[PDB]
Amino acid sequence: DIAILGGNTAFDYGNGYRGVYVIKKQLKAEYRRSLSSFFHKYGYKINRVKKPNLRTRKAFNYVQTKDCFISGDINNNDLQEIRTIFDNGITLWHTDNIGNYSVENELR
Amino acid sequence: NGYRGVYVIKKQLKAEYRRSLSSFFHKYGYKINRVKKPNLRTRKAFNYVQ
Amino acid sequence: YGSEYDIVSVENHKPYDDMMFLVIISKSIMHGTPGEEESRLNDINASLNGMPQPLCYYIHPFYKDGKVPKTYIGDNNANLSPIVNMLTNIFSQKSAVNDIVNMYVTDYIGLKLDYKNGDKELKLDKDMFEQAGIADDKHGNVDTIFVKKIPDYEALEIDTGDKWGGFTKDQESKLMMYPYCVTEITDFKGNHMNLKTEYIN
Amino acid sequence: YGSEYDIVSVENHKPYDDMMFLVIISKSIMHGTPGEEESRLNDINASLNGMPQPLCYYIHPFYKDGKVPKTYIGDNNANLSPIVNMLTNIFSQKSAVNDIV
Amino acid sequence: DYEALEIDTGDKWGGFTKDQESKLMMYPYCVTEITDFKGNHMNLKTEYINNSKLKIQVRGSLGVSNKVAYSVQDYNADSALSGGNRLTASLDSSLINNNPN
Numbered sequence: 091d092i093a094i095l096g097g098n099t100a101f102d103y104g105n106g107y108r109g110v111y112v113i114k115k116q117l118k119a120e121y122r123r124s125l126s127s128f129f130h131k132y133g134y135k136i137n138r139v140k141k142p143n144l145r146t147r148k149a150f151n152y153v154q155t156k157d158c159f160i161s162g163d164i165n166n167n168d169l170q171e172i173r174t175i176f177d178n179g180i181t182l183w184h185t186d187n188i189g190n191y192s193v194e195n196e197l198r
Numbered sequence: 199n200g201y202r203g204v205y206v207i208k209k210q211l212k213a214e215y216r217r218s219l220s221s222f223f224h225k226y227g228y229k230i231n232r233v234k235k236p237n238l239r240t241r242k243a244f245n246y247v248q
Numbered sequence: 249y250g251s252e253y254d255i256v257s258v259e260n261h262k263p264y265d266d267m268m269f270l271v272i273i274s275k276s277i278m279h280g281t282p283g284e285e286e287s288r289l290n291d292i293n294a295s296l297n298g299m300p301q302p303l304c305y306y307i308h309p310f311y312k313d314g315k316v317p318k319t320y321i322g323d324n325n326a327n328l329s330p331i332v333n334m335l336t337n338i339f340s341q342k343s344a345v346n347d348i349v350n351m352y353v354t355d356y357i358g359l360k361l362d363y364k365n366g367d368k369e370l371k372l373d374k375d376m377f378e379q380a381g382i383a384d385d386k387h388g389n390v391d392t393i394f395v396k397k398i399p400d401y402e403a404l405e406i407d408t409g410d411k412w413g414g415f416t417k418d419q420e421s422k423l424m425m426y427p428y429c430v431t432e433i434t435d436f437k438g439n440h441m442n443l444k445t446e447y448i449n
Numbered sequence: 450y451g452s453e454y455d456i457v458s459v460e461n462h463k464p465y466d467d468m469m470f471l472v473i474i475s476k477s478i479m480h481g482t483p484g485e486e487e488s489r490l491n492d493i494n495a496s497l498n499g500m501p502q503p504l505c506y507y508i509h510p511f512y513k514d515g516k517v518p519k520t521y522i523g524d525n526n527a528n529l530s531p532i533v534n535m536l537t538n539i540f541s542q543k544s545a546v547n548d549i550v
Numbered sequence: 551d552y553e554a555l556e557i558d559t560g561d562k563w564g565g566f567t568k569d570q571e572s573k574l575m576m577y578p579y580c581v582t583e584i585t586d587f588k589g590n591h592m593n594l595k596t597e598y599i600n601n602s603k604l605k606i607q608v609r610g611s612l613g614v615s616n617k618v619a620y621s622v623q624d625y626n627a628d629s630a631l632s633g634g635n636r637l638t639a640s641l642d643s644s645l646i647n648n649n650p651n
Contacts, residue, residue, distance in 0.1 A: 091350065091351065091352045092270075092351045092352055092353065092500075092501075092502055092503070093351075093502065093503060093504055093550070093614065094345075094348055094349075094350065094351055094503075095339045095345055095476050095477075095493065095503060097437075098611065098613050098614070098615070098617045098648065099352075099353065099499070099500060099613070100498060100499030100500055100502065100611045100612065100613030100614070101499065101552075101609075101610070101611035101613060101617045101619075102437060102499075103268075103312070103353070103499050103500035104498075104499025104500065104551060104552035104611055104612075104613075105499075105552050105554075105609050105611070106551075106638075107435075107436050107437065107641070108262050108268065108355055109260060109261050109262030109263060109355055109435070110260070110261050110262075110406075110433060110434075110435055111258065111259065111260050111261075111433070111434050111435065111436060111638070111639075112257070112258075112259045112261075112408055112431065112432070112433055113255060113257070113258055113431075113432040113433075113434060113639055114255070114256050114257035114258075114414045114415055114429070114430075114431055114432070115253035115254065115255055115256065115429065115430050115431075115432060116253060116254055116256050116415055116416065116423075116428060116429045116430075117249045117250055117253060117254070117423070117428045117429075118250050118252065118253075118254060118598075120250065121249045121250040121428075122418060122423060122428075123232060124231055124232050125249065125420070125423060125428070126418055126419065126420045126423060127232050127233035127234060128231075128232075128233050129420040129422060129423075130233065130419075130420065131233045132233075134422055191233070194419070201586075201587050201588065202461075202463050202469070203461055203462050203463030203464065203586070204461070204462050204463075204557070204584060204585075204586055204606060204608075204620045204645065205459065205460065205461050205462075205584070205585050205586065205587060206458070206459075206460045206462075206559055206582065206583070206584055206604065206606075207456060207458070207459055207582075207583040207584075207585060208456075208457050208458035208459075208565045208566055208580075208581075208582055208583070209454035209455065209456055209457065209580065209581050209582075209583060210454060210455055210457050210566055210567065210574075210579065210580045210581075211450045211451050211454060211455070211574070211579050211580075212451050212453065212454075212455055214451065215450045215451040216569060216574060216579075219450065219571070219574060219579070220569055220570065220571045220574060223571040223573060223574075224570075224571065228573055251577070251595070252595060252598050252626055253626060254626060254627070254628045255626050255627055255628060255631060255635075255636075255639050256628040256630075256631070257631075258631065258635035258636075258638055258639045260638070268500075270501065310501060312497075312500070312551070313497075314497050314501065331501045332495050332496060332497060332501055333495075334495075335495035335501055335502070335503045336493050336494060336495040336503070339493045339495070339503050340492075340493045353500060434642065436638075436641045436642060440642065450578060450579050454581065457565060457566060457567065458564070458565030458566070460559065460565075462557045462559065462606065464555055464557070464608045464610075464618075472612065474614065498612055498613070499551075499552060499611055499612065499613060504614075506612055508612070550614075
């Protein structure tokens with residue numbers, strides 16, 4: 091409202107606030123480094139029942155399951171151990187430079 | 199009573215808690231929560247690593 | 249993910265860009281028009297403006313330096329007064345100030361207008377608006393705009409481009425999701441809204 | 450880290466330092482200006498002040514002891530009255546305290 | 551048009567006692583408060599002021615009653631963010647002194 095002969099319109103217009111603003115925000119460098127490095131090594135939280143990603147990345151694939159199903163012609167002791175190994179989480183390397191986490195490890 | 203303009207008030211924790219936290223940091227460094235290579239020999243006297 | 253965000257991009261969009269509207273509301277008709285059958289001053293005039301309603305609306309476009317866009321109503325130049333002169337003269341007429349009920353400014357009046365911001369040129373539909381001369385014959389003349397009718401309001405779309413524009417893309421794409429990133433929309437006048445960008449379909 | 454902070458540093462900053470402004474708003478013109486011309490008393494005067502608006506604004510700089518800064522407007526000394534005198538004067542005239550908003 | 555005035559208060563770490571453990575300079579162990587002692591205040595995490603100095607921008611008006619804003623435009627600003635953009639975005643983190651006075 092403007093006086094005739096509800097809020098301070100002069101302050102807003104006089105200082106250039108009109109229309110709509112889009113402000114984009116992201117987390118600080120410190121937490122970007124922290125989380126990025128974690129995701130790089132251990133992928134993402136998934137919480138899906140599906141077949142696991144074993145060799146979808148160029149350098150390594152981390153895999154952790156819960157109560158996984160694995161079959162095959164294998165004596166049952168060894169089969170039980172293999173289920174256990176993926177239930178504890180494991181990294182499957184696809185190159186001979188095992189343990190070098192510096193690489194990009196892009197898809198395919 | 200002389201209140202005009204803007205005031206900048208700077209605050210810090212009390213001596214008791216400064217002593218407390220400083221001594222903890224001195225011996226055990228900082229919480230890091232990063233996947234990286236560890237600092238093994240960056241300080242003159244000792245490096246804590248977990 | 250820490251306790252604060254970096255502000256990484258700031259953009260502003262105004263419905264009519266540099267143009268704002270002044271709105272004046274009165275209890276009755278304050279103006280003459282070129283080629284009107286008879287005088288209508290101080291007549292009650294109800295009209296469709298969003299809904300049926302009994303007040304008289306006048307509007308006046310303006311720029312922050314006090315200038316006003318060349319405005320056409322149909323084929324005719326409305327010869328708008330500059331906003332400051334208009335205000336002075338409008339409030340100088342003792343008959344017009346008794347009618348005036350309210351006045352405010354707004355960024356958007358509910359219409360997409362035929363408006364060229366660069367050329368500073370506004371074209372209005374003559375079925376919705378008309379030339380409004382407010383005369384005293386003691387104080388200077390005012391040329392402004394009378395709202396005949398606006399039955400329905402309409403939405404105007406603003407395209408800000410790629411919704412991921414402005415964010416720095418990390419190799420780990422999950423750092424583009426909320427809560428690591430957010431798009432905030434605000435008018436800096438107490439209203440704001442945090443959007444999870446990934447959910448803008 | 451405990452339940453309270455120590456206050457360890459206090460500073461104050463004022464935009465115009467020792468100077469403050471009194472602002473007076475009226476419905477119409479209350480003043481004469483050097484080099485008039487015709488009287489404008491009680492004329493409506495709209496202006497750009499942040500935005501277009503119809504009121505008349507007067508301002509008057511002052512210090513807490515009631516003195517006022519030597520003020521120039523362009524090349525000319527404004528010869529400001531002391532703030533107290535100005536107040537006494539504006540409100541002494543019914544012609545008009547009714548204009549004052 | 552109204553315009554902003556800048557107040558340079560100097561080194562943003564000035565006044566704090568520096569401990570040997572630099573993390574004791576971060577929030578929540580340290581904080582910078584900006585207040586007008588008239589009901590408006592804002593706690594700043596000093597480390598997130600993107601500038602070596604603490605600079606405050608003042609904005610105001612000449613409307614129907616008092617309104618002054620105190621901003622720290624560098625607060626939470628990305629380094630690549632322009633001064634104009636910083637100032638613009640700073641309003642929702644500002645001391646809004648709107649006591650009518």
